[model samples]
Target chain A: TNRLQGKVALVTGGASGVGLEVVKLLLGEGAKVAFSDINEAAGQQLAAELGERSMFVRHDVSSEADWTLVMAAVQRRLGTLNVLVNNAGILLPGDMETGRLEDFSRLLKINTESVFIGCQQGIAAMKETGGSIINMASVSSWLPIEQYAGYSASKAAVSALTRAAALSCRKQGYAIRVNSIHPDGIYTPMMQASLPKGVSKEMVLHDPKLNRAGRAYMPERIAQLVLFLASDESSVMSGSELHADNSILGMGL
Target chain B: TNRLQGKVALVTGGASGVGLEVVKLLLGEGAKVAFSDINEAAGQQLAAELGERSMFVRHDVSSEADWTLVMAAVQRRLGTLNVLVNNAGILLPGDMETGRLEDFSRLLKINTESVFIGCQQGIAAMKETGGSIINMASVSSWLPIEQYAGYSASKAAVSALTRAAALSCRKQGYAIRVNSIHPDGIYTPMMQASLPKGVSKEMVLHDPKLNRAGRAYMPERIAQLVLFLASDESSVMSGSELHADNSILGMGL
Candidate 1:
């Protein structure tokens, strides 16, 4: 019934939050979807709830072996992989003074390395058929706060790598498209879990609107943008960034 | 003594505001610089202030013919054009509902079309010797206020085109680097004139501590970032963005 009617999509970190919503919308738009996560119970539950046209797999996306196995499963189940969303990440509070090298490297491995696996594998898988890959980046990718320097740098790597991959694809004459989405905070498990100790759901979600929308943050709203990027309408926009939380961009705190 | 010691640069709209500071810094870095603007009086005064290494040309950057003549003048004076900065643009109060088509087109002609001309000429002139091109974009390019849709969209065009130009250069093995910088508001004469009927300096500049630097507004600080970009220190970055105002990217308003 819509833009994604004939596409087959696989979203990493699809068990909860923005990934959950994205999986839901992709299916609603008529795309065949397979979602994965490290959380097996939640992944299976969401997949079961959605029934036909959707499936689930447990993938440790940071591992190349897992990415290979998961993509094989996705192709087998969905027939072909047309869309790939590298949406899984770990958001730990990190600062230059407090962040340890081990912690920073781990964060990079999960948040940044995972995208590398998906983009590379997705590229090989979609070469003949052509496809779209959306890397979930953060506003911090450009302007990160001092506290999250490590996390920010990791995301920054994703953003730069997205450009390089997009350019490489263009040079190679592949019809594939690669782009990134910088979304604001959403009330997903990933975001909620990342909240500092003692912070309340009411405090984070009900805080005065800092976005273009008059209401508070909503996961579904972010999914709406993902649907746009996953669709063909944004075809001309390669190596471009779509900011979902732009009001937070520079009005200043 | 400076990273830009041997480079030759040409900056558009360098008569005042951020442009003026950039001109100052470029000359200080031992680069032979030629700046241009629509205001002959202010342009001449600035050129005279900087002595022989700096010169000012009157350029209506939107005119295609002017671009050819200006680039020719730059080559004749500086011997080579190693860097190009497209910083000339107008800040009109426009939104989807309030903007008129013809007015929007005019804004595009000035803001977006001017960069197009400069980038094209810069590419041709620097084909023999790869160089750098910096385009002045704004935070509005991604997440703009409701009142500045036209301005926002035009700056967005510049950002997107910068990537295309960068990728094209890379694919063709050109040593040229294309990038953009997003800066915060400056207390320039142009910014002062763009203020709407009731907006105040206090309202615009003293809104809060929105930057990493705790200052109401400083033109020279943005120039600091421009200097890094103009210098070879950032040679690895092409199709990238330097967000001088990104400290304000997502802390929320």
Candidate 2:
């Protein structure tokens, strides 16, 4: 349970969904965590409920100023930052021909560019002490879904950015390691919201027609993958895409 | 020789390097070609030499206004746009720790977002006739080059963007097809410029120590991959990465 003992971790979008589970799992493994979410109320409540081991910062991840403030808070509240999870992102519906340029740019800003800033900041924070950066990418990073054009591009950019950052740190003799997780689907509030009104969560979770893998994975299951990456257990892996879902590419589905 | 007869094509960054070879090959295949470059003198001189079959427009690929004007000129001078190649890009040095934010954003704008705009515009121009959109990605899309963090991310984004554009067109029943070419070191003016001042082109080209593949490819050889992708021969392929370099991944080098 103390895999991350004495480590200080920070997670973005930690009020709910995948970020929430990661925050809980990190704390359970004995890490002091400072987590940020746009939801002020939920963030405050979670921080209070989770006790002194956790700190909450309300962050708009796309904003540079917001990231600066969040990083400062982490330094103040949690000693040295060891693990940073760039988990805040969104899935907006947009096709190539008809999708608004605004929507496309917004996804790039939030989903793609946020990772850039996070990695940049994380490198500076951990260059002295050395650390791990886990970016929340998706299967769409490799397998493109037609409807979510912006989302696919955004995630793919994150995956690439992780690789670049990883290589840079290794080459420059920084002990920092960078990697991205490519999950197919997790039954989180985000995924729940994307579904049509009449469709039940169970239907989306179990229906093979809805997901090619015949299941939408639970957040808890996926969070284990995050924990493994965040801990020293994954010391040798960097610039790699760790898949949380079944091997869809191998199956050729 | 008339493989692209009666077809209209546009190649960006077409005055020099791989773009120059693609423009020559496509024109030789009997396509009515409209090519663009930021260098007006070079573009104009090339246009004059290529004669009536080719037209030139000075363009900044990152600008929306430039794309609009270039597309209008292609429609007026040539006919319908049948093949569009987003080939303009730059490679700058920066590692994750010290890379300037401006250089990173500039790379995203020129290398990644330009392709986004190109695919978006190309779909509009070719929806009625079903044409090919070829994106010039790089082996850096899959392989991480530590020094070129921005360049790696930019090319990787291009690869993903190509897939998204391809799937969206296929799903929406638009005749437009999108694919990205990922080539290793090509002996071009761009690469020659990136090399150290003292290092000769031949040393960089033939030195096994300089390149992983033991040699840098020629522009003419890489452009043939572009030609095949732009022709009807690759009609079955879309949303794919065609590598001009040897299989480095398979060899595990």
Candidate 3:
């Protein structure tokens, strides 16, 4: 399990859910982890609980200044980074009619632009030492859930930027690997927010309408994928969209 | 080729290159056309040269006000829009090392946000009347040319927005058909600008590095695909990414 021994890793949105699980997994695998989230209390509490192997930073991922400060802290405290997971994002419900420019622009700034800045920062940090960069995309990048027009656009941009950054790094002779994960339905707080109030996990799991693709998988399952991508296991993979769904060849489950 | 007869069409960036070809094709097929461009002189000259059944409007696609005004003009001047080609975009070269946030944001504003606005407006105008929206994505959306990070991101956003808009329209019981075209290496003026000065068409076509996929195909040829999509021929197609390339099942040419 100590696959990441001596490695330094950074995971965004690490206070809860999939991001939290990824931070735990990386630390358990013997990596020095710098985790960031918008939730100051949660991040601090988690970092304290996790003990000396992990540290927390409050970050608004959309802000370039926040990214720079976080990167500097990681480098100064934990040494040069080896694994960067750009996992922070928001899910706002909007379709063409309901989607306003304000909401759309905000989504782009947070979800899409954050990944852009993260990749740029990650590449600069890891180009000399070689590292893995994992961007949290979603199946919605391809499936395009109608109510999530802005989210879909943002995720799609993330996926494409991952590829572009991957290719650019490779062409520029940087050992940085950039890839994205396209998971179906993970049982995260973010996912729960989209659900009807008072819906139980069992209820959501049973409702195909609620859990399309029959996936209400736990964050642990997705975190395992993240660990693989972050470690040397996925060394050969770059510019790839690894679909973390149960669908056979991406057919409906 | 009078397939679009009695239908009104709106084409953005219609003064030049692929957009120009699409305008010519739509007009030749007997559609009353209103084409928009920032290039007022070129747009007016082309509209005059094309004569009756064609009109030109100056537009900045990124501006929501511009989109609203243009939609109104299309409806008032030509009748309800049956086809909307969100064809206006700019291609700027940038990679991870050289790409800046300003350039990236601008690309999203012009190339991605415009399509978002266009799809929203298109759906509104056509919800009652039924229409086809052809969002101009690119092969870069999937291929991720390292030098074109922003372009790839914008185009990918457009593609995902197309799928989201398509599903939203279908779910809402609207007759709007939204789809994207992902084409490789069309010899448009946009493509020409990326080349060194004095590079001949034959020179570009012969160089695989320059014309990857060996497709220095004319915009007229690509416009044929646009005509097909704009017509009822592609009625069954929605939320689709139609690859207008010479590749077999999207393998490298």
Candidate 4:
């Protein structure tokens, strides 16, 4: 039997990016998954491609109303929510002085506050059933990215919020697990587009110890981590920040 | 001449414990020091003992107005504020099930919010001159300590807030550095008092790796780290958490 067999997972931004890969892997692990993304065309296409195991809903993750709808659908279609992946985030390039106020607000809404909403709702729903919430943080969450202030701040807040929620849940005897993953320089379209004018994909890949070939991370790698955290194997681990940064942080480079 | 020859530093929770040792080190290193603590008797005694270079202000670290008074005194006495160490914190023993809400709140206010307030005030005072702010975090901020939930959460927040403040200051061109030190079990009066009924000081002192004895950190070791961060030698570092726990965090056993 699959580790996630009979479990229901809800992944945000689960269309064309890392979220989509997470959906695929969860389904492969026998999870009944319902995901939401703003990219309607890709969302529908991926849903159809994945057949009956996956369902896609159009969602703007920053909106609490959308979360309500998403959660209702999950309960109606998949029975109970056992895993939540707050993976919907945007990376806007600029340091503190250059980044716009709107950019910071948007990133915080999508990357940080959305996770808060998810945890609030997920915790309420999962209190009886018990579940895991895996937040998609970033390496910049811990380090000063210099150019990505808004994204970095939001992710850092996500990490802190993860710990706070875990403590809260444990205190309440909810048995719900909460953790965050910080991945560095994952080769995604968003990363490529945000790269500076002179910086090439190859250079970006070579920057981290693991990805020296300029190739971005296969979405599957992150998905595997998400699956592990969402599974029973990580029962003892909660309120922790797991770095899947290809050991970039360890290198201290 | 020392870089901090004429500069002033305000360390909260001073007079006794780690804060007292830090004051001694700072004064020795050519910086004028002022510190505050709730213990008036100890505060007055230490102030008289330390004499001209250091003074004591009877103030509660959790009170914003007390911090204001503390900073004002520093400016009046030393002419300029250069370093702020939010070192005073309390740890109450209890895990999620047994910890009292009031105790948790008190610990959070003292351990976490005081640091936040210190950074806010420290940045405002130091923005013009550029300074260093060191918050006393703990290894429990990174690893779970089983029974130190409230204390650990507060330190974790302190670590995150330190990074946030550092990022903001760097962006504003303030050149003010902010970092945290996460020490393991330190040999402090408060730490000694918190030991469980069954645990003994001897057992705590036994070091499996050294094949002899080991115990919590001495105040001087932490003072050394504080002095380094206070100096220009660590100028390149900001928004970082330094683990100077005698390799305790690295020891797997």
Candidate 5:
């Protein structure tokens, strides 16, 4: 669990859900951590609870300027930046006709664009020292859920951007490694947000309407993958799309 | 290529690139095609060049109304549509934040939403006959490039949506089979269009910038796989993602 000992990481959308769990998991792996979320209180509370090893920034991930502030402050507070978990994301699932175009654009801003800025900044901050960049993509990116076009589309882009950035930086001799995680169906607030209005938690998780293969896992499970990617264990794993999924064959990520 | 004989297929974005190559490949194999693109004249020309075995329609893939019209016309012209290639898509290679909202949405409309609509229509048209749906996704979805956020994330969703739709259809015992093809580093005008400023074709294809373990395939190479998925050889492969690039695992598509 201490595989990331001495590493410094910034986990976006880290106040709750998968982000929060990954933050805690990375900390448990011995990484000094900083986290950002739209929720100021939760960010501050998590930092306070984690004591001096952790810092929190209330920042909007989609803003380029905010990325600048976060990167500088992270280096100042943690002494160095070694790992980046671009985990901030939003999901709105619906079909084309009734769904607003603005909503889809906003989803890309939060889900897709945010990862872009994070990696751009992450590469700059870690280029010389070397680091890991893990973008929270999903199995949804590899497979779409009907009516959830916005979420799936943006996620697909996240997966692609991760591969592209990995190659670009790798070519430049930068030690900043970039990879993405495709967590199939994980227990998270984001998952809850994707379900229909008033659908029971049990039903949402169990609904065969979209879950025939039925590949869902826990938040802790995905966090374990984040921990692996953020550590030296994944040294050979740049430009890979890791899956925190339940496929029988378990193809190498 | 004769594997596709007697199959009536519709390929979106058939005017160029992988779509164009796949069209010729399928035609050479003995399938009839009704392809669509915004370029009305090219559509007519390609259809005309292919003779009576093929037809072309000036249809917009992203529009639902257009999908309905295109699907029905293809059926009328070819007798029955048995294969759907949701190959029409757009790509914009730039960082997340600086790219305009309108352009991102437009890319989504063309790249992501177009596939969404195309598959939905494909499912309805082929449910009874039980045909194959092959989507054109990229390795970008699995890996992100330095600045190509919009294209990557959207492409990632194409792969995801195909998987989800595959499972959904499989659950209902619909004869419809859905699959996705991931062509990493496939040489095409699309690949050239995705490069950063002043980067060369050799850089992109010379086994460095975008290739570490070195997995890239030719368009004709992918077209052969497309041929397989369109034929009965892949009858058991619904919800499967077939890769044109080689992996050591040789995971079944």
Candidate 6:
């Protein structure tokens, strides 16, 4: 039997980027998946490609109402929610003084508050089944990227929030587990789009180096980390932030 | 000449606890001391005890106005500020579900927010002097402590925030250095107060076995760490969280 054979997972932002890869990998491991994203076209198309084992619910992760609706659909269709991947997020560029307040607020609402809301609902639903929650944090959560203040702050908040939620679950004698992954500069469509107009992919890849041989990680590599957290392999781990950033934080920058 | 000879140092919460020891050590090494605390009586007493070379300012670390007042007082009294020790903090006991939300908020405000405010002010004031800012973090910042949820969360945020401020200051060519120290179960009034009523001192001493070598750190021992970070000896160190927990984290709990 596969590691996640009997698990039912709900992945937010499952249409594209790291979330898309997570959905495919979970399905390949024989788990039932119900996911949500605001992009209806991409979500629906991906759901069709993945077949009946996967379902996509239109959800703006920041909305509590949408989360409630999605959870209801998940329970009705999948019978139970066993794992939650709080992966939906947006990145905004700029440092502390120059960053727009609106951008900061929006990023917090989506990247931080959405995770909080997901845990609130997820813990309630998974208490009986005893599930796991894997939050999508980033290397920026620890290393302050000058151009991505909003993204960094929101992700840092998620790490704190994840620890708080996990501690609560542990204290309540619930078998539920929660962890966050902090990845650095993965080759995703969103990352490419965020780059300045004239910045080439090659330059972007080599921009941040952890060692003499500098290299950025691929999305599938990050997916493997998520899979471990979502599986029983990491049974003793809770309220931890797994760094899949290829030692980017260890760099002497 | 001593490592910190002719340097001017400011330590918040320096009237008592670990901060007082840091003040004494710094002064012993020939640095001029300007210390701040909310307790006017104790502050005056400690200053008098330390003699003419040390000054005490009655200031609340959580307030920006107090920081402004304190910073100006340091400049006026000492002429130049080259080192900042953000040592003020409070801890409350309770696990996540049982902890008081108000306590959590208060701890975060004092421990985490004050660090940010201190860094902001330190960067602005110390840029010309090329200074070092040492933040007093705790082992609980990274490891989970069952009853120290609020304190742990706050310290974790402080550790993250320290790195952010360090990166920003370095990139801006301010020549300002920032680092945090993570000490575990130091022998202090705070640790003694954290024990349950009727719990014997012997029990506390033996409990170090739970961490590593069956020993808790002395206050003066942690003071040594603060002294290292406060001096130019650690010039290359910034954006780092030093673990002085006596390999407590390495022991299997």
Interface RMSD of each: 4.1, 1.3, 0.9, 6.3, 4.1, 3.8
Best by TM-score: 3
CA lDDT, candidate 1, residue B121? 92
Shift of residue B7 alpha carbon in model 4, Å: 3.4
- Order candidates by TM-score, high to low: 3, 2, 6, 5, 4, 1
> Which run of 10 residues does model 1 chain A get worst, by summed lDDT?
A207-216
**Backbone clash count for every predicted candidate, in the order shown:** 0, 0, 0, 2, 32, 2
Taking the tens digit of each residue's C-alpha lDDT, what string does model 5 give over B184-214? 6667776677778796666655354565454
DockQ, Cα level, model 5: 0.27
lDDT score of residue B244 within candidate 6: 78
Best by lDDT: 3
User: Chain A alone, model 4, TM-score?
Assistant: 0.90
**Best-performing candidate as measured by DockQ:** 3
Per-residue CA lDDT of model 4 for B1-253, tens digit only, reads 3556866889888876778889988988788899888978888888888888887888777677877787888789767888899999987875543454456556656776577678878888988888899999987776666577557756765776678778889777897999999887667666667789876565565356642446466677888889899888899999899887666644555
Regions of model 3 farther than 4 Å from truth: A189-198, A206-213, A248-253, B189-194, B206-215, B248-253
| lDDT per residue (tens digit) for residues A55-160 in model 2 | 9998988777888888988888788899999999987877777666677777887888789889999998998899999999999888877777778877888998
Per-residue lDDT of model 6, residues B1-253, tens digit only? 3667878999988887788999999989888999998888878988999987799999778777888889998889887888999999887776644455456556766776677678778877877768889999988877777677667767766776678767877788878888899988767776778779986456555354463354466778888988888877789999898897777755764
Pairs that collide, model 3: none
DockQ comparisons of all candidates to the true complex: 0.36, 0.65, 0.75, 0.08, 0.27, 0.16
DockQ order, best first, reads 3, 2, 1, 5, 6, 4
Per-residue error for A88 in candidate 2, Å, reads 1.4
User: DockQ of candidate 2?
Assistant: 0.65
lDDT score, candidate 6, position A251: 64
Off by over 4 Å in 2: A1-3, A63-65, A207-215, A247-253, B190-198, B207-215, B247-253
